[PDB]
Design an enzyme around this catalytic site. Structure first.
Site, PDB file in Angstrom:
ATOM      1  CG  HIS A  42      -0.479   0.462   2.465  1.00  0.00           C
ATOM      2  ND1 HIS A  42      -0.181  -0.403   3.498  1.00  0.00           N
ATOM      3  CD2 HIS A  42      -0.214   1.709   2.920  1.00  0.00           C
ATOM      4  CE1 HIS A  42       0.235   0.294   4.544  1.00  0.00           C
ATOM      5  NE2 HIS A  42       0.226   1.578   4.218  1.00  0.00           N
ATOM      6  CG  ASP A  91      -5.166   0.988  -2.579  1.00  0.00           C
ATOM      7  OD1 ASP A  91      -5.240   2.075  -3.204  1.00  0.00           O
ATOM      8  OD2 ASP A  91      -4.614   0.912  -1.458  1.00  0.00           O
ATOM      9  CB  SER A 191       2.833   1.478   6.551  1.00  0.00           C
ATOM     10  OG  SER A 191       1.578   1.770   7.133  1.00  0.00           O
ATOM     11  N   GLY A 192       4.905  -1.009   6.489  1.00  0.00           N
ATOM     12  CA  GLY A 192       5.975  -1.589   5.711  1.00  0.00           C
ATOM     13  C   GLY A 192       7.106  -2.159   6.530  1.00  0.00           C
TER      14      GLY A 192
END
Length: 241
Positions: A42, A91, A191-192
């Site tokens: 994302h 998504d 995030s990630g």
């Protein structure tokens, strides 16, 4: 990370910071080999004003501790050659929220830059296990990012409980990790990044990827993470790792 503490310098040598040119730190990633990082799909979706899906728009910083000292000794700067987002990434639901990032030049292993271990497809990170989340994201929902890398201890939550806390939103690729009472959680900008789990001989394995949450650190709203074992073969097939 909300409710965490400053990490020690070099404590999470697999943690990476991804900057979009002219925008600063956007998300985290984890080093898994000299040439590859794991992150969240994302983070690489285009919007009307910026092509986040274009690998040339990014810079990865390995061995980073403080966002204001990106040229400190031991920090390595790298560009990306390719971003491989999972083909099933959605998504809207964030199902299959995982991506592989190919470094343009290999990372040089050092005391500050070291890969995290990947779990075999059959490995189960059990409900109740303590694991760590790290990142430079917000330290309060709607708050501000951290200059110094933060760490927080959270626990794996039972999947049925997870599904019931976030109805019609949890797929089998997802895992809730945190506390029902809130307090410690990942947040925007984390995030990630990787969930780090201390295994049987002390070596650290990646349990998941920071993905999303309803707010941050709120009661009954633990963070949601993409599971890693499920993707072991996909990672091997696409990277050789």
């Amino acid at each position: 990370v909300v409710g965490g503490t400053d990490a020690d310098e070099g404590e999470w040598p697999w943690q990476v910071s991804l900057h979009a040119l002219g925008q600063g730190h956007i998300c985290g990633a984890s080093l898994i080999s000299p040439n590859w990082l794991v992150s969240a799909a994302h983070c690489y979706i285009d919007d009307r004003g910026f092509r986040y899906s274009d690998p040339t728009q990014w810079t990865a910083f390995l061995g980073l501790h403080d966002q204001s000292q990106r040229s400190a000794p031991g920090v390595q700067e790298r560009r990306l050659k390719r971003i491989i987002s999972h083909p099933f990434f959605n998504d809207f639901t964030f199902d299959y929220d995982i991506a592989l990032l190919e470094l343009e030049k290999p990372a040089e292993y050092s005391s500050m830059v070291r890969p995290i271990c990947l779990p075999d497809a059959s490995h189960v990170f059990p409900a109740g296990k303590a694991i760590w989340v790290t990142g430079w994201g917000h330290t309060q929902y709607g708050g501000t990012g951290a200059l110094i890398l933060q760490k927080g201890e959270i626990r794996v939550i039972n999947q049925t409980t997870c599904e019931n806390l976030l109805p019609q939103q949890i797929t089998p690729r997802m895992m809730c990790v945190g506390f029902l009472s809130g307090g410690v959680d990942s947040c925007q900008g984390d995030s990630g990044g990787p969930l780090s789990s201390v295994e049987a001989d002390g070596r650290i394995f990646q349990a998941g990827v920071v993905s999303w949450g309803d707010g941050c650190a709120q009661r009954n709203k633990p963070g949601v993470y993409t599971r890693l074992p499920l993707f072991r073969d996909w990672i091997k097939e696409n990277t050789g790792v």
